[PDB]
Amino acid sequence: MLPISMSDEGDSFLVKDSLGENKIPKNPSKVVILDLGILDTFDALKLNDKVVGVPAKNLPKYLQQFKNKPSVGGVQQVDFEAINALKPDLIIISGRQSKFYDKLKEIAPTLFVGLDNANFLSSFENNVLSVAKLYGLEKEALEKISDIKNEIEKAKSIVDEDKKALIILTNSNKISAFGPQSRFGIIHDVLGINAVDENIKVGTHGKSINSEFILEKNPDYIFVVDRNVILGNKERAQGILDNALVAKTKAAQNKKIIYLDPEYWFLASGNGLESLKTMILEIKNAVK
Ligand SMILES: [Zn+2]
Ligand SMILES: [Zn+2]
């Protein structure tokens, strides 16, 4: 994916990203943020007062300090009347709102902070550092990125050389597997946990699988992201996976069926200083 690039034009930056080009004022003071990871980065950098709208319908528990901000709807169910009312100087989006880019760009400069699943850390650092440059906080952001890299190193220290993981998303009663360079790929691509099939190629929604598959593969770890939790559905991964086939796996027998927090893994996607730190530590705690 194309990175964000920024040029100094005095009172503003000329910014190019994979969706287009924007003139963004320095120190934007009225920012509408539609990417939850970036909202967490604002919080980390003490930029809370700059934030004028958030997608309150999908506001994670870890970001409840933003519960009094004006709502602009949800990450998919965007309230354009509400956005227009706030008269933002900047709107920040990621992939779920790329379909709305032209409409948003008629409200305010609209910055895209996408994540490249083939180059996650590169994408991450670019997004954080570009936001920080708007405010003259590169030094502070670098320090926080360095700290996350140290935590990655520490986590890698305890990762097993040989054990293998399956990464699955559950939605309704469907189980979909993900691998390297896909969504949720950082468990492999960043932390180096081996995948049960390293050469698996999946689409955007993963590879539909069943419990016979899971047992055939016999993973050492099963990392689960339960989208049922986000939807408020009846079924949950714990019930889906409570069967005699899954029980026979190394993961089940070793209590290494790990239910990852979907507010971080599905909603924030690790696109923030807070979320990514937390997610690295979450994995570390699961495998150590
Ligand atoms: Zn060795
Ligand atoms: Zn590998």
Author numbering: 23 to 310
The publication says:
The periplasmic binding protein (PBP) CeuE1 is an important component of the Fe(III) uptake system in Campylobacter jejuni, a commensal Gram-negative bacterium in the avian gut, but a common source of food poisoning in humans. C. jejuni does not itself synthesize siderophores, but capitalizes on their secretion by other bacteria, such as E. coli. Here we report a combined solution and structural study of a series of synthetic tetradentate analogues of the enterobactin-derived bis(2, 3-dihydroxybenzoyl-L-Ser), to explore the ligand-binding promiscuity of CeuE, both wild type and with mutations of the Fe(III) binding residues H227 and Y288.
His227 was mutated to either leucine (H227L) or alanine (H227A), while Y288 was mutated to phenylalanine (Y288F). All five mutants (Y288F, H227L, H227A, H227L/Y288F, H227A/Y288F) were crystallized in their apo form, and all structures are closely similar to that of wild type CeuE. However while there is clear electron density for the Y288F mutation in its three structures, H227L and H227A are located in a flexible loop region and there is generally no electron density to confirm their presence. Mutation of the Fe(III)-coordinating tyrosine led to a drastic drop in binding affinity in both the single (Y228F) and the double mutants (H227L/Y288F and H227A/Y288F), with Kd values above 1 μM. Site-directed mutagenesis of CeuE revealed that Y288 is essential for binding, as the binding affinity observed in the fluorescence titration experiments is far weaker for all mutants containing Y228F when compared to the wild type protein. The Y228F mutants gave no signal, confirming a lack of Λ-configuration induction, which may indicate a lack of ligand binding.
